[PDB]
Design a binder for this molecule. Structure first.
Ligand SMILES: [K+]
Ligand SMILES: [Mg+2]
Ligand SMILES: [Mg+2]
Ligand SMILES: [Mg+2]
Ligand SMILES: [Mg+2]
Ligand SMILES: [Mg+2]
Lengths: 51, 45, 58, 39, 161, 109
RNA sequence: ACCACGAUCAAAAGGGACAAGCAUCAAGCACGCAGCAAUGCAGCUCAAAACGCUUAGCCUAGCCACACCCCCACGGGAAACAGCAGU
């Protein structure tokens, strides 16, 4: 029973980890889209200059 | 006079090195040195 | 526990954890993110520690 | 010194005590060879 | 092998219509009329495309190892000609040691990428010595004799049995 | 009763693979300094039978005692590889990792 | 126990642990592994102290070692109080 309880505790901590990682993923996606837009503008400027 | 003492010590040192080398192959069971072995004079130019 | 082999590892995984190897061949994994040192001590005492009754018997 | 240095060097090693003229004995028997005076 | 001199500069490869320009413009925008650093940049991107999973990431350990490898090759090429340049000898040796350290870290962290780097750049990873002690003449001679004596004793044992 | 070898289960790092079907492993234990009352690592070398030659230098392995020694110094066998060198799989999440960063995100599965 | 079942006690063998000083003792020189064997590989210990020299009975309900010497004792030196008392 102690081993089973330890496994259940691991599962609960895993659920909390997954929730936290999903939060991190949303904030990531936001900032990464922002940075990707900035880099798109930079590449546009560079391509125009080279042309 | 320091010279002759110094080369005498070098000669005794070479003799001791050769004696250790001989002890090795004697204990290993070889009656003579390994075929083609010759102890180099490493303490004399 | 002088006869138990304790070994430490650093920055090999994204998450800290403890693992206990038993004589039977079983392995016990204890995740320790978000847990204080006192909480970890209590957890290991509960799951793999001798109770006060056994110690008093000894 | 650091704790690592103290561990590696280990406990201090007091050198053995020096034996005196009696060689660590209370007294010694002797035979007189000659008598004289010193300043 | 170096890129052909006709290759376009890294900054002039994705510009639209670069194939529709005069031959003179192609010469002006090729490696033939640039310094060695542009050729090194072309080498670097070729290695990144051939080895790394994401050629755009330059902060990764494997990308850094590739960059240091290109730089080490440039130093070696420089030193073939300037045999008495001590500062660049120092830079080459330091770069080689740093790349060894990076390879050790990559091996400890990502073995598949470590293998792919070692194959792609032709790097033969070597393990460090265990003991750092001076091998003076007496030790060398004694070790050679001990090896010889072991060989002779092995022959004697094999024949006698 | 099951074995005459003192060390029944031990965890170590493979430091040598130059012998046939044998891995040389370094095992560290914590030993108290009687004077300083601080714990220091003490190292010991073990030879472990590795039939399949799957051990690489630097990987963390678990060794199980043989019922009896199979050689002068080989008293243990490779039970498993805890951490393959450079191919570590995170036990908490089960996903491959390179150091402290996930090679495959846990959310992906 | 005495039929052993098995306890108690405890050798040989296997695994582990186990004094001090000296690194001006830094290399040891076969000290490993695999195979039923034939044989194959070239390995094993070591500055986290190997190898060596010197000192010492020890961890005291006691334990270890020795028992004239040649570690041992077929054999040899040679004729034995390191049992008590005694010289
Ligand atoms: K004796
Ligand atoms: Mg016994
Ligand atoms: Mg004595
Ligand atoms: Mg007597
Ligand atoms: Mg006797
Ligand atoms: Mg008497």
């Amino acid at each position: 029973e102690l081993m089973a309880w330890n496994q259940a505790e691991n599962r609960r901590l895993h659920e909390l980890r997954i929730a936290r990682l999903r939060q991190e993923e949303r904030e990531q996606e936001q900032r990464q889209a922002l940075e990707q837009a900035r880099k798109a503008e930079e590449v546009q400027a560079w391509a125009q200059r080279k042309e | 006079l320091r010279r002759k003492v110094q080369e005498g010590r070098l000669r005794r040192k070479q003799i001791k090195f050769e004696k250790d080398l001989r002890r090795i192959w004697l204990k290993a069971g070889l009656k003579e040195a390994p075929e083609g072995w010759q102890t180099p004079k490493i303490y004399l130019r | 526990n002088p006869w138990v082999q304790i070994m430490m590892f650093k920055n090999m995984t994204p998450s800290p954890f403890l693992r206990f190897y038993l004589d039977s061949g079983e392995q016990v994994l204890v995740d320790v993110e978000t847990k204080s040192n006192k909480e970890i001590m209590e957890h290991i005492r509960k799951i793999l520690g001798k109770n006060e009754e056994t110690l008093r018997e000894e | 010194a650091t704790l690592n240095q103290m561990h590696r060097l280990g406990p201090p090693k007091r050198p053995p005590r020096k034996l005196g003229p009696t060689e660590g004995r209370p007294q010694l028997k002797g035979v007189v060879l000659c008598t004289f005076t010193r300043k | 092998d170096d890129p052909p001199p006709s290759t376009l500069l890294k900054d002039y490869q994705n510009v639209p219509g670069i194939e529709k320009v005069d031959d003179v413009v192609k010469r002006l925008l090729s490696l033939e009329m640039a310094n060695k650093k542009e050729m090194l940049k072309i080498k670097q991107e070729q290695f990144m495309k051939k080895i790394v999973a994401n050629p755009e990431d330059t902060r990764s350990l494997e990308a850094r190892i590739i960059a240091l490898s290109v730089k080490i090759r440039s130093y070696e090429e420089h030193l073939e000609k300037h045999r008495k340049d001590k500062a660049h000898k120092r830079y080459l040796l330091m770069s080689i040691d740093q790349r060894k350290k990076m390879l050790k870290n990559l091996r400890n962290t990502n073995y598949d990428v470590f293998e792919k780097i070692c194959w792609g750049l032709g790097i033969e990873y070597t393990f460090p010595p265990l003991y750092y002690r001076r091998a003076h003449r007496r030790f060398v001679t004694k070790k050679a004799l001990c090896i010889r004596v072991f060989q002779e004793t092995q022959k004697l044992k094999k024949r006698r049995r | 009763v099951r074995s005459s070898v003192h060390a029944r289960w031990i965890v170590g790092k493979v430091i040598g693979t130059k012998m046939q079907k044998t891995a040389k492993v370094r095992v560290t234990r914590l030993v108290l300094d009687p004077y300083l009352l601080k714990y220091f690592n003490k190292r010991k070398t073990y030879f472990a039978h590795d039939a399949l030659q799957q051990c690489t230098v630097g990987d963390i392995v678990l060794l199980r005692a043989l019922p009896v020694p199979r050689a002068k110094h080989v008293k243990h066998e490779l039970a498993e590889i805890v951490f393959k060198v450079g191919k570590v799989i995170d036990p908490v999440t089960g996903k491959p990792c390179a150091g402290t960063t996930y090679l495959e995100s846990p959310l992906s599965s």
